[PDB]
Scaffold this active site. Structure first.
Site, PDB file in Angstrom:
ATOM      1  N   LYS A  37      -3.383   0.485   0.393  1.00  0.00           N
ATOM      2  CA  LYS A  37      -3.247   0.514   1.839  1.00  0.00           C
ATOM      3  C   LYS A  37      -3.802   1.817   2.401  1.00  0.00           C
ATOM      4  O   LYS A  37      -3.560   2.896   1.850  1.00  0.00           O
ATOM      5  CB  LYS A  37      -1.789   0.327   2.268  1.00  0.00           C
ATOM      6  CG  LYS A  37      -1.631   0.104   3.763  1.00  0.00           C
ATOM      7  CD  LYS A  37      -0.259  -0.399   4.129  1.00  0.00           C
ATOM      8  CE  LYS A  37      -0.189  -0.677   5.625  1.00  0.00           C
ATOM      9  NZ  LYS A  37       1.157  -1.106   6.070  1.00  0.00           N
ATOM     10  N   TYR A  87      -0.409  -5.257  -6.816  1.00  0.00           N
ATOM     11  CA  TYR A  87      -1.007  -6.399  -6.137  1.00  0.00           C
ATOM     12  C   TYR A  87      -0.200  -7.648  -6.453  1.00  0.00           C
ATOM     13  O   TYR A  87       0.153  -7.888  -7.607  1.00  0.00           O
ATOM     14  CB  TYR A  87      -2.485  -6.580  -6.532  1.00  0.00           C
ATOM     15  CG  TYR A  87      -3.109  -7.876  -6.035  1.00  0.00           C
ATOM     16  CD1 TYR A  87      -3.198  -8.149  -4.671  1.00  0.00           C
ATOM     17  CD2 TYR A  87      -3.606  -8.829  -6.933  1.00  0.00           C
ATOM     18  CE1 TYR A  87      -3.773  -9.331  -4.207  1.00  0.00           C
ATOM     19  CE2 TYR A  87      -4.181 -10.020  -6.483  1.00  0.00           C
ATOM     20  CZ  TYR A  87      -4.258 -10.263  -5.116  1.00  0.00           C
ATOM     21  OH  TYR A  87      -4.811 -11.429  -4.637  1.00  0.00           O
ATOM     22  N   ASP A 131      17.240  -5.176   7.289  1.00  0.00           N
ATOM     23  CA  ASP A 131      16.801  -6.565   7.453  1.00  0.00           C
ATOM     24  C   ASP A 131      15.650  -6.897   6.505  1.00  0.00           C
ATOM     25  O   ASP A 131      14.813  -6.043   6.209  1.00  0.00           O
ATOM     26  CB  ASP A 131      16.359  -6.820   8.897  1.00  0.00           C
ATOM     27  CG  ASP A 131      15.283  -5.846   9.362  1.00  0.00           C
ATOM     28  OD1 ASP A 131      15.554  -4.622   9.369  1.00  0.00           O
ATOM     29  OD2 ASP A 131      14.174  -6.303   9.721  1.00  0.00           O
TER      30      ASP A 131
HETATM   31  C1  LIG Z   1      -1.447 -10.473  -1.216  1.00  0.00           C
HETATM   32  N1  LIG Z   1      -0.824  -9.472  -2.113  1.00  0.00           N
HETATM   33  C2  LIG Z   1      -0.473  -8.259  -1.671  1.00  0.00           C
HETATM   34  N2  LIG Z   1      -0.112  -7.308  -2.553  1.00  0.00           N
HETATM   35  C3  LIG Z   1       0.237  -6.093  -2.161  1.00  0.00           C
HETATM   36  C4  LIG Z   1       0.236  -5.796  -0.803  1.00  0.00           C
HETATM   37  C5  LIG Z   1      -0.131  -6.788   0.114  1.00  0.00           C
HETATM   38  C6  LIG Z   1      -0.165  -6.557   1.491  1.00  0.00           C
HETATM   39  C7  LIG Z   1      -1.183  -7.149   2.236  1.00  0.00           C
HETATM   40  C8  LIG Z   1      -1.234  -6.934   3.608  1.00  0.00           C
HETATM   41  C9  LIG Z   1      -0.266  -6.126   4.200  1.00  0.00           C
HETATM   42  N3  LIG Z   1       0.696  -5.569   3.474  1.00  0.00           N
HETATM   43  C10 LIG Z   1       0.778  -5.753   2.145  1.00  0.00           C
HETATM   44  O1  LIG Z   1       1.787  -5.171   1.427  1.00  0.00           O
HETATM   45  C11 LIG Z   1       2.606  -4.272   2.059  1.00  0.00           C
HETATM   46  C12 LIG Z   1       2.344  -2.907   1.912  1.00  0.00           C
HETATM   47  C13 LIG Z   1       3.160  -1.954   2.524  1.00  0.00           C
HETATM   48  C14 LIG Z   1       4.253  -2.357   3.294  1.00  0.00           C
HETATM   49  N4  LIG Z   1       5.065  -1.465   3.903  1.00  0.00           N
HETATM   50  C15 LIG Z   1       4.653  -0.634   4.872  1.00  0.00           C
HETATM   51  O2  LIG Z   1       3.480  -0.627   5.257  1.00  0.00           O
HETATM   52  N5  LIG Z   1       5.597   0.187   5.371  1.00  0.00           N
HETATM   53  C16 LIG Z   1       5.469   1.108   6.353  1.00  0.00           C
HETATM   54  C17 LIG Z   1       4.260   1.354   7.004  1.00  0.00           C
HETATM   55  C18 LIG Z   1       4.185   2.303   8.021  1.00  0.00           C
HETATM   56  C19 LIG Z   1       5.320   3.015   8.410  1.00  0.00           C
HETATM   57  C20 LIG Z   1       6.545   2.781   7.782  1.00  0.00           C
HETATM   58  C21 LIG Z   1       7.794   3.586   8.226  1.00  0.00           C
HETATM   59  F1  LIG Z   1       7.898   4.709   7.503  1.00  0.00           F
HETATM   60  F2  LIG Z   1       7.675   3.897   9.524  1.00  0.00           F
HETATM   61  F3  LIG Z   1       8.918   2.893   8.053  1.00  0.00           F
HETATM   62  C22 LIG Z   1       6.608   1.823   6.758  1.00  0.00           C
HETATM   63  C23 LIG Z   1       4.518  -3.724   3.432  1.00  0.00           C
HETATM   64  C24 LIG Z   1       3.710  -4.683   2.819  1.00  0.00           C
HETATM   65  C25 LIG Z   1       4.046  -6.173   3.009  1.00  0.00           C
HETATM   66  N6  LIG Z   1      -0.486  -7.993  -0.353  1.00  0.00           N
END
Ligand SMILES: CNc1nccc(-c2cccnc2Oc2ccc(NC(=O)Nc3cccc(C(F)(F)F)c3)cc2C)n1
Length: 240
Positions: A37, A87, A131
């Protein structure tokens, strides 16, 4: 370990998320496949979550469970933050649910079991999950659920033991295909959760109604323990 963007080969996009895009990636040092990410300092600053993210990642780095999506580590450069994540090949439970419309009792119980085991692990280490949405629930290669959680899903105390309320709302949604307190208006949805107004369609079995009814209590203290969910007759009869 001192990670950098040079350490990864970037593949296809896996979709947008909260505060950035997620990409399929492969680490050159191990050839291992993962998800990356990309976040932005300026966007995280503008909202004011930079300090909350740094805490979440520190906690998230110290959690090793097969039903929690693994955060291998993280890094940043001048203007970006990078999360190195496991992943999940099989996508979200959200997407599966809209594909399949609803789940049978074996799929639901098995999922709830997986959730309760991950939530037990987190309880034994004093970590609390708020949640839980189906959007934050991912699926591994063996079909196993993985929590990726760093109104319809919020308990009465958060709008006016949170784990348990979440388990009840999900168990309902998995079998029925819609969250228990969903309505046409935010005010009507508020009233439903506060007064705990849910009704089952005819097909929901009595064993499932017992579990959901015990999980969706207004008083947090009157909700069962996670062990009691795992030993519930409906769960053990239907879980793989
Ligand atoms: C298909 N397979 C697959 N495999 C691994 C990943 C994905 C994936 C794909 C698309 C989007 N998110 C995906 O995964 C994620 C990755 C991180 C998060 N969490 C997140 O971004 N949290 C977050 C952010 C900012 C501020 C904050 C804060 F601090 F403000 F709380 C907290 C949540 C998901 C669900 N998909």
């Amino acid at each position: 370990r001192q990670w950098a963007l040079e350490d990864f080969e970037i593949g296809r996009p896996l979709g947008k998320g909260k505060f950035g895009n997620v990409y399929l990636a492969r680490e050159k040092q191990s050839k291992f496949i993962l998800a990356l990410k990309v976040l932005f300092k300026a966007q995280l600053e503008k909202a004011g979550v930079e300090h909350q993210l740094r805490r979440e990642v520190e906690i998230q780095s110290h959690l090793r469970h097969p039903n929690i999506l693994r955060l291998y580590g993280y890094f940043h450069d001048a203007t970006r933050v990078y999360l190195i994540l496991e992943y999940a090949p099989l996508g979200t439970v959200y997407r599966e649910l809209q594909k399949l419309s609803k789940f049978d009792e074996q799929r639901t119980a098995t999922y709830i079991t997986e959730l309760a085991n991950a939530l037990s692990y987190c309880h034994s280490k004093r970590v609390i999950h708020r949640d839980i949405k189906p959007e934050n629930l991912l699926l591994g290669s063996a079909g196993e659920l993985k929590i990726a959680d760093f109104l319809d899903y919020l308990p009465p105390e958060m709008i006016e033991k949170v784990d348990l309320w979440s388990l009840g709302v999900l168990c309902y949604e998995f079998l029925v295909g819609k969250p228990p307190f969903e309505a046409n208006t935010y005010q009507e949805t508020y009233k439903r959760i506060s007064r705990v107004e849910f009704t089952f369609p005819d097909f929901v079995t009595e064993g499932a109604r017992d579990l959901i009814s015990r999980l969706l209590k207004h008083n947090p203290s009157q909700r069962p323990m996670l062990r009691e969910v795992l030993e519930h007759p409906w769960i053990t009869a239907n879980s793989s």
